[PDB]
Amino acid sequence: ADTIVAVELDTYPNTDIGDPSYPHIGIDIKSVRSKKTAKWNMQNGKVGTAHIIYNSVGKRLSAVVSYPNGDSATVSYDVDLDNVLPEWVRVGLSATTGLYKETNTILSWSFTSKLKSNSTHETNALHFMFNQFSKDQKDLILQGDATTGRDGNLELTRVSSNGSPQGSSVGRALFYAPVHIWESSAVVASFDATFTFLIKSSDSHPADGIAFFISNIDSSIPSGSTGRLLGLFPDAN
Amino acid sequence: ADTIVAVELDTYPNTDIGDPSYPHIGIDIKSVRSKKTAKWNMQNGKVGTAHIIYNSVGKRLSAVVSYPNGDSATVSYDVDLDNVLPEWVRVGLSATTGLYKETNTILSWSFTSKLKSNSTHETNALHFMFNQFSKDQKDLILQGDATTGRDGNLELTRVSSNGSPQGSSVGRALFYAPVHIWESSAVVASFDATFTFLIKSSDSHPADGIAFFISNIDSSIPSGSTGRLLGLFPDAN
Amino acid sequence: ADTIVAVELDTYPNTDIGDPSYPHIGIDIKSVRSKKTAKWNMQNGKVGTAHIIYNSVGKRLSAVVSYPNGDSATVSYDVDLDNVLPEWVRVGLSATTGLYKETNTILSWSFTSKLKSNSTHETNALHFMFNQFSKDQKDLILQGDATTGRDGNLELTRVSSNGSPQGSSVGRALFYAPVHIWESSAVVASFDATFTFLIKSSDSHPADGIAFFISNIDSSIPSGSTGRLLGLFPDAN
Amino acid sequence: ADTIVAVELDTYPNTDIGDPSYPHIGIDIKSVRSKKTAKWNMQNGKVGTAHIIYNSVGKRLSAVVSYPNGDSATVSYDVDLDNVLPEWVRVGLSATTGLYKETNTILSWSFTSKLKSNSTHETNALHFMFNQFSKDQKDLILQGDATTGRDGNLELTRVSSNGSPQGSSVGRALFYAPVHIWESSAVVASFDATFTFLIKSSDSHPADGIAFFISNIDSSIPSGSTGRLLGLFPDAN
Ligand SMILES: OC[C@H]1O[C@H](Oc2c[nH]c3ccc(Br)c(Cl)c23)[C@@H](O)[C@@H](O)[C@@H]1O
Ligand SMILES: OC[C@H]1O[C@H](Oc2c[nH]c3ccc(Br)c(Cl)c23)[C@@H](O)[C@@H](O)[C@@H]1O
Ligand SMILES: OC[C@H]1O[C@H](Oc2c[nH]c3ccc(Br)c(Cl)c23)[C@@H](O)[C@@H](O)[C@@H]1O
Ligand SMILES: OC[C@H]1O[C@H](Oc2c[nH]c3ccc(Br)c(Cl)c23)[C@@H](O)[C@@H](O)[C@@H]1O
Ligand SMILES: [Ca+2]
Ligand SMILES: [Ca+2]
Ligand SMILES: [Ca+2]
Ligand SMILES: [Ca+2]
Ligand SMILES: [Mn+2]
Ligand SMILES: [Mn+2]
Ligand SMILES: [Mn+2]
Ligand SMILES: [Mn+2]
């Protein structure tokens, strides 16, 4: 199976798999059962911003999610990703719907990774930033139901012609280049990611959420990973 | 055929194809016959640095090549790359040898491209930096004789076990992700590239040189493009 | 007198000093009489974006001004700033009103300067970005009527309590740190600046405009430089 | 008194003030008595690199110091700098000698700070990088014995004509612009700093060390702060 590290913006409480009984943000290390969560007051129809930050010195993965009205939720977890992830990875965004649904619209996404070696003034780095997505966005690998270009956005899950989100959908977008996320001889390895999103739901309950994730380079959507599994995990272990 | 825009560091004068009778730097637009050149005093065995700069507003492609002793050569050419290149490209480094030879060793390479739209505060961008190259450098596409990892460097052309450059060699390295180099609706499109290199030759005449290039995404080494064609062009038209 | 290099967004045609008979953008080298101008269709009450770009290799100063509806104006001028400016400078924004008036509201401002030496991998650089301005913005030097903090913006010229722009006003904001804009031993010196602005006028004719400028470090508003002199020049020579 | 947060590279063990009995790196919050230290094997005459990293989400200040041979030391400390520092600060480097001495030579220094607001896509940021220091480095405030320009370096403490470090010396260099290090309404505030240094000593014991520090904007060298107080603190409380 794939190796997954993710920050989840989980809009639907699945208590059977350890979700608290409210929308929440979470840090997921090789399991959909978050290692740490925080209560998140998701604002229907508003544009939110998620920031994710990590460095190999502090060994603390942190995320904050905020809206323009100033409300925010944060979660941090002590983890040495050198000991979890493979050296080379791909990075991406994933989202799902299940019985319940929501738009999983990404308006922007940026990422920076740096490896600083012990050799003086020697750094390798990658940075990308998307503030618009075209219909043919060649530097993205789209999986599942994900599409680009609708109003210049990235729609991770299926939306009808009229804008209505569909159930039982899963989609992901991965940056085309592999990323060298750590190296044994690096003195510092760090990364940051930011994305903005618009989650909207008309009926009783948004679901299921959006995640930023880091995976093995050949990661694909696991079979049956719609709904609560967020397009990331093959089961809820 | 491919579409190529390149900055050449040409170490060997091929007067039959318009080279001046001295090593030179040149700007090549869809032809190995440079649109503009400047005399370049290549320092055998020293580490040089090339900087390449362009933006769609000024429409001027510029390059400077320097050594630590302060000697430098510069060349600029007025060109609207919006009207030359396809919208999506790959970027890379290329080098060759022919009857005569040299090491074509790359010690570092960085690149930044930005597309700034008319939509306020909306930019797409890509940046990468290599100061070391590993034996398995997954975010590079190596073509021809190019290898990575020897002393942490990128060797564009063939070098023997003992360090001796070989003749009739061609190799290229392209960044793995396609790059969105221009867009009709962009207000500014800009890019910059820098690389450091060590060209060394023992005998009578180094050849043939190193180039930074931008190509169609599916660009491959043209058949028979060793020596004076720099791994870039199928002929000298 | 000060030494000034500026990009002007000139909203009011003063034909006596060489303005064309329409709003225009211009490149000003040591004189308010622009070396080059382009027609600019200023959109009353809309947020515009100006980008300014220069490098010492190409020796071409360029500016583009755009609005979200896609309309833009561009101007470029060949100039070697190494031969014009002092080595150390301050950078800033300036605006004025005269008999006629407008809001000269700055919503964001960024700047990057880099000096790349002949010594391998040695660069000096400065970058700043403002997307909000507080009432006490300590890293700005405010001159004349300029204020910060009103709706988180920078108001270069005087606006009343009720939002009405006042006539005969001049104000500037300079970044607090001096900037090393060129150096004889640098192989490349480059800078970029971007700012977003909202110019609004109720009556017959907006005036007078906004400029991005680079000056001697001790630059101050010249006496009598309201109106057509843009807070930059002591006279119209 | 000033408010100081610092990372110390402490070359001389002063056990009376809580130093361990070996050279060490330490995190100092409002006291020279480090909150956390780690053993540091200082390599006489070699160029070291210090990286310092912090963000307001994770609330963990980290530092690593390394040499090209791969040896490194790291220290991290949980601290919410929002609750320690004033909103506006200056950042700098400090060093001292006492009865014993060493060169405190800085070869490069970079710093980045970012404030990301809850308003979507609104960030304020400052970045600077020095890889060479001139005799008149106008964007630095030099205090005490600090000088710039000797071999293009920053010498924090006094060195004679012939290169010999002098005792009882203290000097600091602060970036000229104040830095907005936190803001109550910011969702993320982060900073990073890196510097390279060459500490050399001829005799029995190097002393006293180098520190990266963040202070109130009007910070000056406290009276009597040579030697073990590192130019940072007025006493050893
Ligand atoms: O989209 C929200 C959820 O819908 C499904 O689970 C259900 C939530 N409430 C229900 C009520 C009845 C039935 Br049958 C089901 Cl499967 C569910 C499943 O698709 C879940 O994976 C998912 O998280
Ligand atoms: O490496 C330098 C050059 O060597 C070859 O051309 C020759 C340069 N001097 C010669 C002398 C004899 C013969 Br045969 C040849 Cl092909 C050459 C060719 O491989 C050229 O493409 C190349 O630029
Ligand atoms: O604000 C626009 C302009 O107003 C003034 O010039 C005039 C423009 N039309 C006028 C009509 C009458 C008189 Br008196 C004057 Cl000074 C002017 C002056 O303040 C100018 O410097 C300025 O550019
Ligand atoms: O430079 C190293 C140290 O030298 C001085 O302390 C001494 C270290 N060993 C000594 C031996 C004798 C005397 Br007197 C003194 Cl003050 C010292 C003092 O200047 C200290 O602050 C300093 O850390
Ligand atoms: Ca859930
Ligand atoms: Ca040639
Ligand atoms: Ca005018
Ligand atoms: Ca000590
Ligand atoms: Mn969950
Ligand atoms: Mn040539
Ligand atoms: Mn004008
Ligand atoms: Mn100590």
Author numbering:
A (entry chain A), B (entry chain A), C (entry chain A), D (entry chain A): 1 to 237
What does the paper say about this structure?
The carbohydrate electron densities of M13M and M14M and Xman complexes are well defined in all subunits. In Cbol:Xman, however, extensive interactions are observed in the binding region. The O1-linked mannose of both dimannosides, M13M and M14M, as well as Xman, are bound to the monosaccharide binding site in an almost identical way to that observed for ConA, CGL and ConM. Other than in the carbohydrate-binding region, the complexes do not present any significant structural differences when compared to the unbound protein.
